[PDB]
């Protein structure tokens, strides 16, 4: 299972949550931004590594980071 981390530079535009193809990220209430929300990655075990969340993130550098890690049946995208 890969590792997905979220930093505090997020502005809560909800693009990463919409971009995820396996329902890994969601949004929670927060306090330190105008949008009053921040993303989170509870369902880490379902990540495949497509890095679409990093593709859709407006910041100087990404506030969501994906590090590849130990692979399994789910992360390898195998249907057989």
């Amino acid at each position: 299972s890969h590792s997905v981390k979220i930093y505090d530079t997020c502005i809560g535009c909800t693009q990463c949550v919409r971009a995820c193809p396996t329902d890994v990220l969601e949004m929670i209430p927060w306090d330190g931004c105008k949008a009053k929300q921040i993303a989170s990655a509870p369902r880490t075990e379902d990540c495949v590594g497509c890095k679409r969340c990093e593709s859709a993130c407006p910041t100087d550098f990404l506030s969501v980071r994906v590090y590849l890690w130990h692979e399994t049946t789910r992360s390898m995208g195998l249907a057989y």
Binding site: D8, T9, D31, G32, C33, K34
Partner: peptide, 8 residues
């Protein structure tokens, strides 16, 4: 931003 609790 004028909120004292905003980080950036």
């Amino acid at each position: 931003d004028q909120d004292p609790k905003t980080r950036y």
